[PDB]
Amino acid sequence: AVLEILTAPDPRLRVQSKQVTDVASVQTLIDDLLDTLYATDNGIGLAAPQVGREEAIVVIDLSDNRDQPLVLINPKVVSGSNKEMGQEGCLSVPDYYADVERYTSVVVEALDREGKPLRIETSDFLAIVMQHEIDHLSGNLFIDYLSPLKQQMAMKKVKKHVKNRAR
Amino acid sequence: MAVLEILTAPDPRLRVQSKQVTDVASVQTLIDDLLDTLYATDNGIGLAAPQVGREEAIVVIDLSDNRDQPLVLINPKVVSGSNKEMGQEGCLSVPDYYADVERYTSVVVEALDREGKPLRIETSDFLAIVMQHEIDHLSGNLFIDYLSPLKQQMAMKKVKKHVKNRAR
Ligand SMILES: [Cl-]
Ligand SMILES: [Cl-]
Ligand SMILES: [Zn+2]
Ligand SMILES: [Zn+2]
Ligand SMILES: [Zn+2]
Ligand SMILES: [Zn+2]
Ligand SMILES: [Zn+2]
Ligand SMILES: [Zn+2]
Ligand SMILES: [Zn+2]
């Protein structure tokens, strides 16, 4: 039974994540986050609040073959440049896509799953994904940046998806 | 162990008239691949052959929570129905768009099962709606076809966002 991904609204998506002090204690959760990620059709990033957990942990795999896990423990965006709009979705706001401003160049510091420091500097699509996933750990969803109308539309779409039966 | 790709609208393959099966033993592979494709979806409960680019008049359904209640309908036809009501539908080939569509809430369907034995299903349960939606695919019809041309255009827009998206 892989962990289920929560959908908005759910108060667990809005909790501030807590720093991990004991990396050895969160190995199960890391493996479970990866299993949940990989059980999705097209998921490329998953943050712990999306499965209802408060630990500051993100997992990402941007590879075509889905065999390139990136685990970020206690991630932070340390700097960034080159703001651009780009379309995002989120497994926790299913079926709704919209353009969001992000830094297209970023530096993130985190620990890897073994607890070793990691510094990732990137101007690729990874930059966008990390910012999106790290935002979850602050209790933020990408729709939060959108006009009120768009936010309303997003919530209505999620509800349709959640309530629908016939596919 | 890939499953078959579910095609998304617009695609001419979704608009073909399906062909009657006359040799049931010859489409057993397809039936199994249809079911595997369906079971690989997050929450699909019905898939019709045109949605994988196949011409055969075959639909597979599984309404169960456990996904161990496959219903295979070969050469299905709606024979009768009554008590039309609006109800929300979606479709694996029109992802991320949902709308209200009219269907009979009571229906009679005739088909063959995967062994080629006659099947007559008379139901007032949600299966009625699912059967009508899936049978519609074999006539080259999508649920959005009952909607205004403007809602159809919006549906296509939402499908395209889904198809093109990367960040999730
Ligand atoms: Cl929420
Ligand atoms: Cl089409
Ligand atoms: Zn994500
Ligand atoms: Zn997300
Ligand atoms: Zn979807
Ligand atoms: Zn949906
Ligand atoms: Zn279906
Ligand atoms: Zn359909
Ligand atoms: Zn989608």
From Swiss-Prot, chain A:
Enzyme class, UniProt record, top EC level: hydrolase
A UniProt-annotated Pfam family:
Pep_deformylase
This protein's source sits in the domain of life called Bacteria
Cofactors required:
Fe(2+)
UniProt-annotated binding residues for Fe cation: C90, H132, H136
* Metal-binding found in the keyword field: yes
For this entry, the protein name equals Peptide deformylase 2
Give the source species. Answer: Vibrio cholerae serotype O1 (strain ATCC 39315 / El Tor Inaba N16961)
Q: Taxonomic classification, please? A: Bacteria, Pseudomonadati, Pseudomonadota, Gammaproteobacteria, Vibrionales
